[PDB]
């Protein structure tokens, strides 16, 4: 599919820079048609086919079209889709509270309520995108933004469908893989992937909202895999002695190595603790 070509500049007026990737740079903009605000997600394209540098076309037009198919509280929209000879620009949805990671970094730790009025939103988010078939793989504190941060329950959206890929056979297999922390098992052996894996993510941000650390993360990475490969964690008492054993059940539930017997995003949403290299 091919985008608008005009020069992006003429349409919208472009400011602060909100985030940073590999192959990204996002920045906040304003469209002069309408005065409204975005997200600006400047892309960095291949040069060549065999190429490190930049994304392939193949894996912009996957981010792309997942965009455009979803809408939901929960969740970024795509406004439009600009291009030019070295990236692909979107115009997204803007999320200006800030990243649940820097939220989190500068509240230490969370009560199981806190927590909860935050997970269900995921969960609601989580649950429009698998009915959708679509696998998220990338759910972690720095893809999930508040829309503002001074309020006692802030609403969320999940972000970054970079690593997001339709799941229309119950599993994909292509080496798809993120950041360690969050990655579930299957993914560290690189075995076939489906919407289970997006359910182990949530157990460790749940992990993460309720302690305040990381429940595999170890000194490097490949220490972190193994880790995770082996279901390597516990509760440590220092921090989780006050915490519920109806969240640690919930917990235990999703940080389950076998897909086939972790938590599915409608079990999640019925569990008597949400349930209201
Ligand atoms: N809609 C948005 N509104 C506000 N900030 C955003 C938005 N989308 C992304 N960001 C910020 O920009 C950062 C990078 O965006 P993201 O889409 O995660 O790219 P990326 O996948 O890291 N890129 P790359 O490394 O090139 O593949 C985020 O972690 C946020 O801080
Ligand atoms: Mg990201």
């Given at each position: 599919t091919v985008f608008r070509q005009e020069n992006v500049d003429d349409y919208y007026d472009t400011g602060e820079e909100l985030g940073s990737g590999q192959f990204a740079v996002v920045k906040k903009c304003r469209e002069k048609s309408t005065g409204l605000q975005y997200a600006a997600k400047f892309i960095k394209k291949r040069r060549?086919?065999?190429?490190?540098r930049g994304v392939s076309r193949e894996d912009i037009e996957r981010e792309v079209s997942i965009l455009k198919e979803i809408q939901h509280p929960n969740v970024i929209t795509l406004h439009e889709v600009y291009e030019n000879k070295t990236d692909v620009i979107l115009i997204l949805e803007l999320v200006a509270g800030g990243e649940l990671f820097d939220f989190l970094a500068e509240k230490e730790s969370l009560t199981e309520e806190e927590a909860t009025e935050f997970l269900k939103q995921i969960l609601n988010g989580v649950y429009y995108l698998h009915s959708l078939q679509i696998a998220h793989f990338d759910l972690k504190p720095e893809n999930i933004m508040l829309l503002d941060r001074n309020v006692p329950k802030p609403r969320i959206k999940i972000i970054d469908f970079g690593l997001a890929h339709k799941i229309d056979f119950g599993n994909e297999f292509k080496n798809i893989f993120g950041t360690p922390e969050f990655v579930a098992p299957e993914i560290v052996n690189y075995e076939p992937l489906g919407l289970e894996a997006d359910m182990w993510s949530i157990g460790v941000i749940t992990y993460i909202l309720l302690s305040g650390a990381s429940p595999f993360l170890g000194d490097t990475k490949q220490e972190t895999l193994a880790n995770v490969s082996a279901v390597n964690y516990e509760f440590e008492d220092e921090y989780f002695s006050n915490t519920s054993a109806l969240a640690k059940d919930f917990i235990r539930r999703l940080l389950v190595k076998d897909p086939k017997k972790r938590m599915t995003i409608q079990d999640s949403l019925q569990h008597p603790w949400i349930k209201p290299f």
């Open positions: 060549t086919k065999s190429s490190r």
